[model samples]
Target: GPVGYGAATTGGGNKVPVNVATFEAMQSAIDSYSGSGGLVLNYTGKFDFGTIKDVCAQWKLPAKTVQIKNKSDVTIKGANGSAANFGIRVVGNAHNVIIQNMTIGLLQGGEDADSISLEGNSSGEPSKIWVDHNTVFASLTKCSGAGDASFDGGIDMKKGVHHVTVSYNYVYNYQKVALNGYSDSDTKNSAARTTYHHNRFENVESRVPLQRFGLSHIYNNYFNNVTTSGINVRMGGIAKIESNYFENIKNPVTSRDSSEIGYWDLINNYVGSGITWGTPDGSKPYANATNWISTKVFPESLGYIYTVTPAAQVKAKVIATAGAGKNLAE
Candidate 1:
């Protein structure tokens, strides 16, 4: 996996990490080929998105996405504060990058543009990235750009990308939250060893990612007030989930629940009395992935089990300060 910070490389070998001060420097670093593994800062006081102007209109898909093309091991970070009114898109064989302590997609409450979207080149080199300690806001109150039903995802990873570790961030108020894989027919190049842990999911509807053809490890995450389903593992994906807090949610784990076709290991999870997992009629099973949906997808697991965290302390600790501009000493 391309886990941890963008310090060492898992793909290209021994890329050194650098530091740039401003977002422009960060963009320049991402644009340059030699800058590979570097960290850029947007650490401001309130990490606000309400003040910035959005350039997207017509609610078109392309209008929302902000693209950052070509580079590797580039990290955009915050020094206790960071904010944004726009979102990010990384492509063109981008690998070994990290985004931390930052806030993105806060201005657009509803649009197809995501806070952070990463993809490997269509030619086969997928993205290798890590997202940590950031807030991806889809809340209309915090978002001043596009209107509701305009945004798509908080963090969307796709196109056979590899090594994604999403942790310690707060993703709130969205329709589709996060996505792992996009292609269904392009099944051979699945992203391997993607992990999401110690995060908070508040008031999201779904996708929350609807993973396709990948091995995902989701644990210790707090899901609060999810109106729809939470963690819909679909399209032959395997999710080894444990010790997650699910409250005010409908279907905590919704995907091939009746069969083991696409397997999910539900262990040590805490689901509040709000919604029953398989209580017959009340639960509405959600499957939002319409592109390349397939059944030929195979399901497998990594012969491992994670050390579970206790459910008693999940809400208190996970929700304490998991978003951007948070200074509660997380």
Candidate 2:
């Protein structure tokens, strides 16, 4: 079944209010389908989600949080410049899902606004999911009465959600945590194998937590002009930090706890300047951790490749000739 909605036909055209068309389209899809298992949803227009609430309310088909198992694909693809109010949210134990190739901007007009949020748990086993190749940007103009610290993040993994991979995305320019993994209780076995790779963080604050314990593997990512620490491993388990680039950051990595025991493999990374390994908190310093590995690798610059001017716009170039593909022997 296919469902579609457009704003231009909503009588007001450009003057039409927030995500009316998008919300109508999604509501129509949810109301049309009664059964569960193997469902597909495709979004194709700019939307304002101000009128929508509890985006995952449609997952009540099976009456259980852990329903709709196996190859159930729900894909949301946006136009080049489609503006979505609250990205896409899936909660209540949906397993083996994939959300990709979309842009979610200006989220969290209310309290529960997030670009992509996964909540609840599926029995005892972890939910298998993947959220990648998306971009989330917060509004520069702060909303009324909205606290300066907003929860506008590219992705948020909360409520004991597990076995997820968030990779290959560009996320930045937010007031709150750019990417977050959080849980309240110390559920021993309820850990998520969250892997973040090949992503870009630009002008983000509070990327990670200080001295926490969860299962996180952060590797092969690029960060530029970040305000807080690039990678903050706070109160987690078995965090592997390797093969990443940190450029023009205030504090590249910071930890706050020493009692948290886990393997932190810091290897093969490049920092621009002002990169500190530990914070002022009581977290164990990198020198004390035998598992930590630090090597001086030459940085690789990815500068501007194109420019426009009245006098025959000149094409820029990528200069990788300096230490292009050499290993750091330290």
Candidate 3:
């Protein structure tokens, strides 16, 4: 039902869809949609935006991103069975935007890139965004030099971004899946809040995500073959972790990798075979129950309404609905 802080987003409200068939056409649609609320851009086929270098030259920008900048009340929906080997960067006060039903992969940016990144900077941060029903992935095998850094995050929110929801997506074979907030010293990051639910995360390394200094609600998500960690709440943030299904995961829930620790309210989660709560060591400090608190970490009540699907049923439910080319196919 598109719940959470972004629940109020009514993207491209009743607008006639604008169909774009090629990469250039798609970019044009997005660029022209700026300042024009209620604009819907629908992709009609697959895309192969070459390497970051090629993309940078084409866009005439230093970075390799299809910039969704300086706009609001927009929707970008992918065509059925279409996949894009590129990234989307949402920034510059863009609010009430929805990016969904797409398959984004083979992202080729260094450490700062992501398949879908919501970022904040001097121009003001994007808020009330929804990234839903998408499938994002890259190689699980580490590359030379950068190792896992060959690709960055699957979906990342940073630099004081807030009021977002990530739901019903399939993310796999990624090193760093998702990130919340930018740095520990960014005090403005404390305002960041997001909800992750009904998503399928598989064969990933970590950061399902690495939350820093915010409030998060993660529930009813399926985690499988997680290698390094999952849901590392750090820098004094708080998370409500409940009804999640974890299988073959390492460090399913803990606060680690930060000088400052965080807390979580764990409830009714089901863990399958090959799981470790956390492997704390001198290099990586870990905290879970050490700072455990009640759900009161959230408001007395959540701002939006949601139903908690049973952990056992999460895998089946998420697989059935997540990713592109499903119900939204035309």
TM-score of each: 0.75, 0.64, 0.89
In candidate 2 the C-alpha lDDT for residue 251 amounts to: 58
In model 1, how large is the Cα lDDT of residue 5? 24
Candidate 3 Cα deviation (angstroms), residue 183: 1.8
lDDT tens digits by residue: candidate 3, 121-205 = 8899889888989999776655555544667788998888888889888898788899897677777778888989888899999
Give per-residue CA lDDT, model 2, range 227-307, as digits (tens).
656565544445556566666765566543443433465655554554544344554543222223532221222121211
- Angstrom error at residue 113, model 3: 3.7
Q: Report the lDDT tens digits of candidate 1 across residue range 227-246.
A: 76677776567777767787
- Which prediction has more favorable TM-score, 1 or 2? 1
Task: Decide which is better by lDDT, 1 or 2.
Answer: 1
Range of the 10 consecutive residues with the lowest summed lDDT in candidate 3: 54-63
The residue pairs in collision within model 1 are 37-73, 44-81, 47-82, 47-83, 110-150, 110-151, 111-150, 111-151, 120-126
Error of 2 at 310 (Å): 37
Off by over 4 Å in 3: 48-63, 277-285, 288-300, 328-330
| Model 1, position 3: C-alpha lDDT score | 33
Residue pairs clashing in model 3 are none
User: Which candidate should be chosen as best, given TM-score against the real structure?
Assistant: 3
